[PDB]
């Protein structure tokens, strides 16, 4: 199945969770492909890809090359497809390339149809671009990533979530009355809030600086075990394909 | 002076800091206009504007109405210009309105020439849209907001900051080794880094839930004192106009 992960706003932990969940699924013996759909191209750095390695599926496609040449193998059960590095000129003129990437959708559908992967995870930005909408439409299931704070609380009342998404809390803290109050309200009012959440965890802050997914970096960190419970929930609930 | 504030990533605290800095400048006796240029229209909620108040400068402009009628008074020395509430379709297709807002720039230039305000603060998104670029171009100075973490560290090496921007740290934690390592490295290598920072503070998490800027909500909070330091720094260093 294709699983999309998309933050309700920036910086909530979407990429770190995508890398961690991919690692946990492959640890459980699933074959995984993880695709970076974010133009910031950060997912690869959780898998020890050199910063100067600029290749990626979108970089290749914009250069008139074959996006399949940009795949990377992390383990025998986890492949990675970086976005690739955009120039500043490209970053500052997104409409000159945001409509030139649509061939990735049929390409990923063909790779999905091969049977090589039990999971295709897509790290999605929330930039309302044509390509983001098209990739989200490929997904069988989606996770909307939040932090428990007033900004995410407001956003849940004024922006769309991916259709059928479940909501995953990250960065859950101790010693915060306002967080506890928002959380108690969400428990009663957000039906699709997942039963597990991810705490703020020093291993989740360190693992990117170590260029590893959290479960590889520190398997006995609380966040690593919480991500494992998320992986097991996905196996039980998200293995089906959309009709 | 026109001062732009823009996060290097989403969620780093840009809007809370904009509201807090506007409050501090007006407390110091400056006449301040604060403009929300973010389509999520969140700044107004730090100033007790009703969520169902839909009006704003962009909403008016897109409806063919007068943006100058969308301002709100908060104090005798602080006025607010909300963005306005966008429909889901407008939110999901920003290319349809991001080139229709150019008239706000000539209007803000005229407002600056009037001398009605000593400070015009603009809360900016990071989306590389036409309107964001145009608003940035009329700022005399800008602040690029970061958190000290591996994500922001990478971003500073691969994306553009506004021309002449200084970097402002927010959300600084107590007791994180990877944070201290990144910070010590930045002190020796990041020539744009400001000499003051803003700590993680429960007051900054609570103030939006109380619909107030942080310095009004809890004037003796550490974050409120740090914002006041920033305000005094802006008075000394950012009062000059661009030529």
């Amino acid at each position: 199945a294709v699983l999309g992960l998309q933050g309700v706003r920036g910086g909530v932990g979407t990429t770190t969770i995508t890398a961690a969940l991919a690692w946990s699924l492959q640890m459980l013996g699933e074959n995984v492909l993880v695709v970076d759909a974010c133009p910031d191209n950060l997912l690869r750095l959780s898998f020890n890809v050199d910063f100067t390695h600029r290749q990626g599926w979108a970089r290749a496609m914009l250069d008139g090359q074959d996006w399949r040449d940009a795949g990377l193998r992390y383990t025998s059960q986890l492949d990675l497809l970086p976005f690739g590095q955009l120039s500043i000129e490209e970053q500052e003129n997104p409409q000159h390339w945001q409509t030139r990437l649509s061939d990735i959708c049929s390409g990923l559908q063909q790779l999905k149809a091969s049977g090589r992967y039990q999971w295709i995870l897509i790290d999605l930005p929330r930039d309302a671009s044509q390509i983001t909408h098209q990739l989200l439409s490929l997904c069988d299931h989606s996770l909307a990533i939040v932090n428990v704070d007033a900004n995410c609380h407001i956003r849940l009342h004024q922006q769309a979530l991916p259709d059928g998404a479940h909501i995953l809390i990250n960065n859950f803290r101790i010693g915060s009355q306002v967080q506890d109050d928002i959380y108690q309200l969400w428990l009663q009012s957000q039906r699709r809030l997942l039963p597990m959440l991810i705490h703020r965890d020093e291993a989740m802050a360190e693992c990117l600086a170590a260029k590893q997914p959290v479960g590889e970096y520190r398997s006995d960190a609380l966040a690593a075990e919480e991500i494992l419970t998320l992986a097991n929930w996905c196996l039980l609930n998200y293995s089906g394909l959309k009709t | 002076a026109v001062l732009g504030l823009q996060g290097v990533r989403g969620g780093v605290g840009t809007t809370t800091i904009t509201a807090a800095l506007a409050w501090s400048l007006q407390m110091l006796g400056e006449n301040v206009l604060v403009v929300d240029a973010c389509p999520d229209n969140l700044l107004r909620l730090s100033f007790n504007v009703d969520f169902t108040h839909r009006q704003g400068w962009a909403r008016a402009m897109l409806d063919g109405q007068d943006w100058r009628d969308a301002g709100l008074r908060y104090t005798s020395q602080l006025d607010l210009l909300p963005f306005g509430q966008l429909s889901i379709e407008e939110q999901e297709n920003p290319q349809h309105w991001q080139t229709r807002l150019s008239d706000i720039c000539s209007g803000l230039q005229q407002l600056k020439a009037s001398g009605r305000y000593q400070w015009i603060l603009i809360d900016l998104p990071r989306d590389a849209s036409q309107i964001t670029h145009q608003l940035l171009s009329l700022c005399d100075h800008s602040l690029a907001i970061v958190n000290v973490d591996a994500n922001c560290h990478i971003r500073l090496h691969q994306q553009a900051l506004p021309d002449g921007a200084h970097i402002l740290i927010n959300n600084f934690r107590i007791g994180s080794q990877v944070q201290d390592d990144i910070y010590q490295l930045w002190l020796q290598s990041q020539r744009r880094l400001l000499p003051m920072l803003i700590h993680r503070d429960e007051a900054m998490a609570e103030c939006l839930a109380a619909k107030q800027p942080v310095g009004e909500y809890r004037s003796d909070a550490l974050a409120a004192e740090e914002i006041l330091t920033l305000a005094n720094w802006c008075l000394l260093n950012y009062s000059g106009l661009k030529t």
Partner: peptide, 26 residues
């Protein structure tokens, strides 16, 4: 247990006008 949850939520909405505002307009 049911009324216990409802009483704690009442206190949270009284603490935070942003939460009360959104709950009351749902």
């Amino acid at each position: 247990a049911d009324i216990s949850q409802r009483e704690q939520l009442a206190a949270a909405l009284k603490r935070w006008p942003l939460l009360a505002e959104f709950a009351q307009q749902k």
